[PDB]
Design a protein around this nucleic acid. Structure first.
Ligand SMILES: *C[C@@](*)(O)[C@H](CCCNC(N)=[NH2+])NC(=O)[C@@H]1CCCN1C(=O)[C@H](N)Cc1ccccc1
Ligand SMILES: *[C@@H]1O[C@H](CO)[C@@H](O)[C@H](O)[C@H]1NC(C)=O
Ligand SMILES: [Ca+2]
Ligand SMILES: [Mg+2]
Lengths: 256, 32
RNA sequence: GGGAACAAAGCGAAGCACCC
């Protein structure tokens, strides 16, 4: 996260860290959507152009964390993965269209002060809140600067930034990459003066909105891609969770 | 499900608000 | 009118080929 700040304790209790067993390293963000389902970006798990193709046994999820690196005794919980499901039309070749994946945990996590699932939006909630000019919130342990080896550009603790949703034609004109109806973008315009963006390391993390209708937090987006981080005239791109909710539900209804 | 989703034990459940959620709520004032 | 359309191909402060 570029130009964000330190999260408060328990601010984002649905935040999940995806962690490589060997070498031991942070891979990506993710989000907790029930006691045994975790949502993330497909490119965190499968991206052949970088020879990336993880299996269940390559990975842990770490839930309830605040520090990037410290083992948080009696706070964080670690789960193994039972199965990974990649969206069947995930387009890694072109533009990361449908950059979304589900991971089923081997056993359920217990909820706590620091661990709690986020809501997924119904049609009315999505139609109401997913509007240009409305702000949501992005969280992650990814890079602090566009320019992961470099320890000055790695956060000590979870980072948070609030960002406005951007009109679709502005998103489209900002980049030569093809934007699909399964994406949206967010970020301040250069004329708005304020700054902030997701960055490398933040993929899979949630873009969330607090509903003014029932005071609940909904995940509208998954950090998916960009070009550099926090450049004037560039915006972060996010997988459109509501648009692919039928798939999410299909997997969960079918696979236990 | 998901019964009790989206309500943070250390914030909504204690009627406490985090430092920047007001910025999100104010962004609804207009639109759209 | 209803279902489906694993939001598939498409179409702006994005909200509109299969079966009955
Ligand atoms: C995997 C995630 O950590 C990361 C998120 C980057 C978010 N950046 C901003 N500014 N919000 N995603 C990536 O690194 C993805 C995966 C593959 C390449 N990629 C990119 O973002 C490229 N920089 C651009 C791109 C190339 C090919 C296809 C789509 C986008
Ligand atoms: C990913 O890994 C599995 C083996 O674990 C392999 O069968 C599959 O074809 C791989 N997919 C790609 C696209 O590399
Ligand atoms: Ca920007
Ligand atoms: Mg489509």
């Amino acid at each position: 996260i570029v130009e964000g700040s330190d999260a408060e304790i328990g601010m984002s209790p649905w935040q999940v860290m995806l962690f490589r067993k060997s070498p031991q390293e942070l891979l990506c963000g993710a989000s907790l959507i029930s006691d045994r389902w975790v949502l993330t970006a497909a490119h965190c798990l499968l991206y052949p152009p970088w020879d990336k193709n993880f299996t269940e046994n390559d990975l842990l999820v770490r839930i309830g964390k605040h520090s990037r690196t410290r083992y948080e005794r009696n706070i964080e919980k670690i789960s193994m993965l039972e199965k990974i499901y990649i969206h069947p039309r995930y387009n890694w070749r072109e533009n990361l269209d449908r950059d979304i994946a589900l991971m089923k945990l081997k056993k359920p996590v217990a909820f706590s002060d620091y661990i709690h699932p986020v809501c997924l939006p119904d049609r009315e909630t999505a139609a109401s809140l997913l509007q240009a000019g409305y702000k949501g919130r992005v969280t992650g342990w990814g890079n602090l600067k566009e320019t992961a080896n470099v320890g000055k550009g790695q956060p000590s603790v979870l980072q948070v930034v609030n960002l406005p949703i951007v009109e679709r034609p502005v998103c489209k004109d900002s980049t030569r990459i093809r934007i699909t109806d399964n994406m949206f973008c967010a970020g301040y315009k250069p004329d708005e003066g304020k700054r902030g963006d997701a960055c490398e390391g933040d993929s899979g993390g949630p873009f969330v909105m607090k509903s003014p209708f029932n005071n609940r937090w909904y995940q509208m987006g998954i950090v998916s891609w960009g070009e550099g981080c926090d450049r004037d005239g560039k915006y972060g791109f996010y997988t459109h969770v509501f648009r692919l909710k039928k798939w999410i539900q299909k997997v969960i209804d079918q696979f236990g | 499900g998901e019964a009790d989703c989206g309500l943070r034990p250390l914030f909504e459940k204690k009627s406490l608000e985090d430092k920047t959620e007001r910025e999100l709520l104010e962004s609804y004032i207009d639109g759209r």
